[PDB]
Amino acid sequence: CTVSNWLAGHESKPLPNLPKSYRWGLVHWWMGIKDSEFDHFSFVQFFSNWPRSFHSIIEDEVEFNLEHAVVSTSELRLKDLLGRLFFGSIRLPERNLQHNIILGELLCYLENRLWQDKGLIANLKMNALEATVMLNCSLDQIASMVEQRILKPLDVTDYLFHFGDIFCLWLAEFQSDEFNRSFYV
Amino acid sequence: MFLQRPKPYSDESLESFFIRVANKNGYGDVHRFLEATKRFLQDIDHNGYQTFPTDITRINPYSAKNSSSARTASFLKLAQLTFNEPPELLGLAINRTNMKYSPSTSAVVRGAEVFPRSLLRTHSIPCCPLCLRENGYASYLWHFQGYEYCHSHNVPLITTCSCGKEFDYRVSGLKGICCKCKEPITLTGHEAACTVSNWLAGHESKPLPNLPKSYRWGLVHWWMGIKDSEFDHFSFVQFFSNWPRSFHSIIEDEVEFNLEHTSELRLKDLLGRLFFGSIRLPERNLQHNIILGELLCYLENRLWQDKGLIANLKMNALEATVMLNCSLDQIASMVEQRILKPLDVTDYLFHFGDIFCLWLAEFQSDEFNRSFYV
Amino acid sequence: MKLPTNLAYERSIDPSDVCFFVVWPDDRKTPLTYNSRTLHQVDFCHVPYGASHIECSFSVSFSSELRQPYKCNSSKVKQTLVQLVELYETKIGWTELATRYLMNICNGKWLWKNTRKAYCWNIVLTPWPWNGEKVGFEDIRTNYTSRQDFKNNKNWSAIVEMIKTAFSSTDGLAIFEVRATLHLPTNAMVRPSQVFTEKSRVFQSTTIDGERSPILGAFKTGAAIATIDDWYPEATEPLRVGRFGVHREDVTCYRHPSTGKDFFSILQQAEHYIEVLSANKTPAQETINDMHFLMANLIKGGMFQHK
Amino acid sequence: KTITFLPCNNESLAAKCLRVLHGFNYQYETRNIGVSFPLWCDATVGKKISFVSLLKQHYFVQMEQLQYFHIYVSFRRCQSIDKLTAAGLARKIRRLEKFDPSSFAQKEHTAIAHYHSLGESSKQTNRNFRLNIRM
Ligand SMILES: [Zn+2]
Ligand SMILES: [Zn+2]
């Protein structure tokens, strides 16, 4: 009844004030969290600790795949440490972080710890593929920035880039009026 | 190095932020702080310390050739380490962005407000010395054309003092003491620019609509292409003053010049200036890109009128991707399965009575959709 | 103006190798050594424990051999390139280019990475056509940062005016003797230059007193005196002076020939710059930065042929 | 048993397993086990680490749940290599100081006959080191 009031488009606390599209976006996401069908009472208790229940999640997810890393800590990849969290919240339905609060909070717990721990998060390898997913661009704009080298380095599927390089490129060359750092702050 | 945050403001320019730090914390000018700042990045082994400017002119991240990614990477370190409580510096920078305008004008962005690249001032920044004594810092609106008058005192902005010499805050500090005379600058009433700069600031001022800061600045580029001249503050107020019948008054006259100058008429030949110069300015939010939605509401009630005149206006596959907000691969996909009906990409086999019905069926969004101008 | 099939200059600036010494307490000197590992051999060079600091030593001559071409078969190409040096020095002057070369000596730009993690380092110059009391720069990291800090030294006039007279006179010489004093931490990383091996780290070395010692390259040293080039479009970092000026970090040419501002496209406008310099209106900043770069490539030397 | 690494940084992956064996010899404080690298190639360690004399301990259960696990010679620690690296040659002077340091010198030509390294750390402190292992 908290959910059916909230999925109607109406207010129920502590569940947030969002548009009609962006309340459906939480539902397909939360089903992948349990890896089952939707659970409604654990939906309510999860957002009584928002965002520190989501802060409770990302602490679990980076500390696991560092233990269960198969390659060395310099050969780690972004899809191998955080391929589940970062690639599961990009377009819900769009990159509007003012309403997609999942990625817009995820950016906060990625930017802050970048150069903590010898720059572990800021040195994650990336393809030319997943560089286009984060920037919201195409492969041709990556291939244009390797010629003139605004973007420091072609094989698209060979891991040539670093995450703190792609993260700081978004903040100076690829924002928008919705997908920018200045709504969640 | 260890510093102090001053009083933080929600309209301070970035160049004013490196003077309110450099005065307070015992440096001689702005040049001394920048030189000290570049060395600091060398000690903590930042990659683009060698690109960090000692000129306060090129401090903004669009002045970098390739190191704009390393300039905000230089900016993402100082707010975490060299202060006590972290200051807001990324919220003051003028970053580039890829948001192309109509027809091909690029854009820069300062936080959550996107500006036309063609409206940036670069020669000499006008200022108000009354804000340079009471506020004492530089408002970020001073970096742009279109903003001619100070909206907080109703007084004009100065560019040349009494001795024939100019004035700029990036070279003459934040007090207001000029070069040749080292005096207080002698000042230089209207309303037509006064209410625009109150609207350009981000407050509510009529008859200019309640658009966001990204969309209040997307219209000033659009109107200068209409008059094809320098910006008249008087007519930009009076254009919105009779919405919608002042905005329609060019529209019904745009067709009458182009009907006389009927099936080989095109949408580029009959409604080419109003439509192609209004798609993204800056984006496709029809709640706040009011130009397209009112023209669509004009052309929804003109679809199959005049024996379907507007339904018989021809479109390509290139200029259909401008409307539908898609790529050329999805256009050729709808030719194989035949949802859109008639390969040459620049072929004139597509009409406006055919495209607009497809957008109401297969191409909506949350902002580029019919659900605002109903 | 088409380029001949025989053109060449000599360099006007001639560095030497760099010699690394170690100053123990009791104030005595011993040349620095390094290791060699095999199991593909990698050499490691670090300061010994009881050391106090480190000297360095080389010598630069502003020979001024850029006045006339070394070899040039066409006499029209020779008579033009002589008139630019006599017009650059009359209308602009060597003061801007003498200061930028001399800063790279008078701070440790020729100490490439060994500057990093130091307490203080000092430079002492021994100029040759000179009276006495050697010019010494003290505590460069704090005292000297901006150019003005160099000009507040008591004799900065008297040493730019050597390099000008060395470039102005048809037999000008101006030998310098540079000596540095790096106060490192204990057991510090020191990086010398290193040989080229066809393909893991083998240093370029010499013999100082029957022992091996790492030496900064003679060519390695002149590449840091010539980091002057910041006249390219949207310039941020100053570059090593060269034709179509490369940047080896991000492997790209600024001043690529499609920009129109490499060296060979400015040599073909050499007659064009003679009419600008021989007016009375002072030319623009855009068109003397083209002349500062044009003179820095005749000081660099090289071969300028075609066909 | 003989553990198979089936994805792979075996060198850095085999080295975490000893950290469990480093910690499990403090809860029970035994040394009754042996260490054997069968596929000791002259490049890598090989995807076979084996304990001879684990399979139910906390680290190896979650390792086994995913689709990648199956669960003479003298492998001795050689910390004489650790003093060949020249950050330790100056530690060694401050040891032997307890005098002229300038009459001590370097070696300038060394040849280390097939050592092998596995990088680890401490847990009292925040300090790293190397487990140099040869035949
Ligand atoms: Zn004011
Ligand atoms: Zn004045």
**Number of C-alpha atoms within 13 angstroms, CB side, residue C181?**
15
Nearest to C55 by CA among C179, C141, C176, C177: C179
Q: List all residues 6 or more positions away from C154 whose beta carbon is below 8 Å from its beta carbon.
A: none
Q: From the CA of D118, how many Å to the nearest CA of chain A? A: 11
Identify the experimental approach: cryo-EM
* Distance from Cα B160 to the centre of ligand 2, integer Å: 8
Would you list the domain boundaries of chain D?
Answer: 2-134
Residues of A in contact with B82 (CB under 8 A): none
CA angle A19, A21, A23 (to 5 degrees): 70
The answer to whether chain D touches chain A by having 3 or more C-beta pairs less than 8 angstroms apart is yes
Strands C18-24 and C212-216: antiparallel
Strand partners, B97: B107
Strands in A119-159 per DSSP E:
125-126
Q: From the CA of C162, how many Å to the nearest CA of chain A? A: 41
CA C293 vs CA A128, C106, C132, C230: distances in Å: 38, 22, 34, 9
* Distance from Cα B95 to the centre of ligand 1, integer Å: 26
What is the C-alpha separation between B51 and B72, in angstroms, rounded? 11
φ, ψ (nearest 5 deg) of residue D34: -120, 155
Strands D110-111 and C37-38: parallel
Q: From the CA of D6, how many Å to the nearest CA of chain A? A: 9
CA angle B284, B288, B292 (to 5 degrees): 55
Instruction: Write down how long chain C is.
Output: 307
CA angle B298, B304, B307 (to 5 degrees): 120
User: B114–A177: do the CB atoms touch at under 8 Å?
Assistant: yes
**Number of C-alpha atoms within 13 angstroms, CB side, residue B204?**
1
What is the C-alpha separation between B317 and C40, in angstroms, rounded? 60
* C-alpha torsion sign, points C263, C269, C273, C276: negative
Q: Can you tell me which residue has the tokens 């203080």?
A: C120
* Distance from Cα B174 to the centre of ligand 2, integer Å: 15
CA A84 vs CA A79, C136, D12: distances in Å: 7, 61, 24
CA D108 vs CA C200, C211, C249, D84, D115: distances in Å: 16, 10, 31, 11, 19
The answer to whether chain A touches chain C by having 3 or more C-beta pairs less than 8 angstroms apart is yes
What is the C-alpha separation between C299 and C94, in angstroms, rounded? 12
CA C33 vs CA A9, B99, C212, D110: distances in Å: 76, 58, 6, 14
3-state DSSP of chain B = CCCCCCCCCCCECHHHHHHHHHHHCCCCCHHHHHHHHHHHHHHCCCCCHHHCCCCCHHHCCCCCCCCHHHHHHHHHHHHHHCCCCCCCCCCCCCEEECCCCCCCCCEEECCCCEEEHHHECCCCCCECCCCCCCCCCCEHHHHECCCCEECCCCEECECECCCCCECCCCCCCCCCCCCCCCCCCCCCCCCCCHHHHHHHHCCCCCCCCCCCCCCCCCHHHHHHHHHCCCCCHHHHHHHHCCCCCCHHHHHHHHHHHHHCCCCCCEHHHHCHHHHHCCCCCCCCCCCCCHHHHHHHHHHHCCCCCCCCCHHHCEECCHHHHHHHCCCHHHHHHHHHCCCCCCCCCCCCCEEHHHHHHHHHHHCCCCCCCCCCCC
**Number of C-alpha atoms within 13 angstroms, CB side, residue D25?**
10
CA B190 vs CA B154, B161, C149: distances in Å: 8, 21, 50
Using a CB–CB cutoff of 8 Å, tell me whether B326 touches chain A. Answer: no
Using a CB–CB cutoff of 8 Å, tell me whether A75 touches chain D. Answer: yes
DSSP string covering chain C, please?
Answer: -PPPSSEEE--SEE---EEEEEEETTTEEEE-----EE---B---B--TT--EEEEEEEEEE--TTSS-SEES-HHHHHHHHHHHHHHHHHT-THHHHHHHHHHHHTGGGS-STTSS-S-EEEEE--SS--SS-EEE--HHHH-SSHHHHHTSTTSHHHHHHHHHHHHSTT---EEEEEEEE---TT-B----B------B-B-EEESSSSEEEEE-HHHHHHHHTEEE--STT--S-EE--TT-EETTTTEESS-TTTT-SHHHHHTTTTHHHHHHTSSSPPPHHHHHHHHHHHHTTTT-EE----
Query: Structurally, what CATH architecture does the domain formed by D2-134 represent?
Result: 2-Layer Sandwich (3.30)
Nearest to D5 by CA among A77, A158, A68: A68
Q: Can you read off the two tokens belonging to residue B226?
A: 């209409």
What is the C-alpha separation between C29 and C270, in angstroms, rounded? 51
Containing H/E element for A20? helix A20-34
CA dihedral of residues A20, A24, A26, A32 (deg, nearest 10): -170
- Mutation site, C234, C250, C251, interface A, largest A CB count within 10 A: C250
User: B42–C116: do the CB atoms touch at under 8 Å?
Assistant: yes
Could you tell me where the DSSP H helices lie in chain D? 10-27, 58-65, 91-96
Give the experimental resolution in Å: 3.2
Q: Please name the residues between 19 and 48 in chain A that touch chain C, using a CB distance below 8 Å.
A: none
User: A72–D68: do the CB atoms touch at under 8 Å?
Assistant: no
DSSP three-state, residue A6: helix
Q: Can you read off the two tokens belonging to residue A14?
A: 């502590």
CA B248 vs CA A113, B254, B266, B291: distances in Å: 54, 9, 20, 11
Nearest CA in chain A to C249: A152
Using a CB–CB cutoff of 8 Å, tell me whether A152 touches chain C. Answer: yes
What is the C-alpha separation between B344 and C145, in angstroms, rounded? 63
φ, ψ (nearest 5 deg) of residue A86: -75, -35
Are residues A114 and A123 in contact, defined by beta-carbon separation less than 8 angstroms? no
Which residue type sits at B90? L
Using a CB–CB cutoff of 8 Å, tell me whether C275 touches chain A. Answer: no
Containing H/E element for A103? helix A101-106
DSSP three-state, residue A135: helix
DSSP three-state, residue A65: helix
**Residue numbers followed by a gap, chain C, C–N over 2.5 Å:** 39, 199
Crossing angle for the helix pair B194-201 and B233-240, to the nearest 10 degrees? 70
